[PDB]
C-alpha cells in the first residue's frame, strides 16, 4: 500500500505450484486460486512468513516469495495449529500434513480405490452416481 507508481521489479504475472497468479489483485485473495489454499490458511501463512497481506501481489519479491514457500510445505514446524491443516490426519502416515495442488488429485481418487476393494456401502453409491450422505433423491436434483 501507499503505492501510486509501480515497482521497478513489478512482476505482472506470478506463477507457483503450476498455477499462475495475476499481479494486480490483493495478495491474500489472489493466492486462493491455488487448490488447497483458502483465505484462512492464507492470512495465517503470510503472517508467520513476515509478509504484508494488503499489498498487491505484484509487489512482493523473491526473498519473500521463497520464504512463503517454505512454511507452505512444512507448516507444523512453524507453530501453525494441528487442528488447522486440511488433512488433519492421514491413513498410512498416521501424522498430520497439508497437501497442495500437485498431489490433491490422489486424495479423493486413491480414497475411492480403498472404498471399492472393501465393498463398502459408501463406495457403491459413488459408482452408480448417487448421493453419498443421507439425502433424498426422489425429487432432489433431477438431471
Amino acid at each position: 500500500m501507499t503505492t501510486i507508481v509501480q515497482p521497478n521489479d513489478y512482476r505482472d504475472l506470478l506463477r507457483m505450484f503450476n498455477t499462475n497468479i495475476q499481479g494486480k489483485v490483493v495478495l491474500e485473495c489472489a493466492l486462493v486460486g491455488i487448490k488447497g489454499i483458502g483465505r484462512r490458511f492464507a492470512n495465517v501463512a503470510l503472517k508467520k512468513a513476515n509478509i504484508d497481506v494488503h499489498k498487491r501481489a505484484g509487489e512482493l519479491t523473491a526473498a519473500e516469495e521463497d520464504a512463503l514457500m517454505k512454511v507452505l510445505e512444512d507448516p507444523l514446524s512453524h507453530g501453525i495449529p494441528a487442528w488447522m491443516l486440511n488433512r488433519n490426519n492421514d491413513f498410512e502416515s498416521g501424522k498430520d500434513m497439508h497437501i497442495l495442488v500437485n498431489t490433491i488429485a490422489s486424495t479423493h481418487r486413491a480414497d475411492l480405490e480403498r472404498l471399492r476393494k472393501t465393498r463398502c456401502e459408501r463406495g457403491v453409491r459413488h459408482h452408480h452416481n448417487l448421493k453419498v450422505r443421507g439425502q433424498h433423491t426422489k425429487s432432489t436434483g433431477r438431471r
Binding site: 483465505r39 492470512n43 495465517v44 503472517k47 507453530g79 488447522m84
Partner: protein, 137 residues
Amino acid sequence: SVTRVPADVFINSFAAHLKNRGIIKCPAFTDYVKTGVSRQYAPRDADWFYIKAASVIRHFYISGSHSIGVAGLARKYSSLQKGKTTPHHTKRASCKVIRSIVSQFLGQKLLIAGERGRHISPNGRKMVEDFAEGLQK
C-alpha cells in the same frame, strides 16, 4: 466523565495508551483466531485485542456495582451466521479471549472479584475517568 464523550474517540485513545503503558500484552493465540463462530474470516487490523479490551473496560465502568460474567460480555459481541441456504440464526462470540482479557485486567487490581463475576474496582474507575477528562478537552 466518560458518559459525555462518544465511544468512538474514547476507545481508540484508551487503546493506544493501554498499548504504550504495557498494561495488556497480546498472547500468542492472537495470530490465528476468528473471534466467534458467527464470523468467517479473521480480523484485518493488527491491534484488535486492545480495542476489545478498552470496550470491555468501558462496559464494566458503565455497569457500576453490577457484575458482568464472561459470557455476559460474549452476548454483546454476537453476530449473525450466514451462508447455509437456511434462515440466519444468531450466535455468541468467543469467550476465551474475553477470559484472558479479564484475567489480565484483574492481575492489575483494576477489576475486583464479586460474588458472581466481577466489577470495576475504585482505582479502575479513577483511571477511566482520568483518561476521560484528559481527552475531553
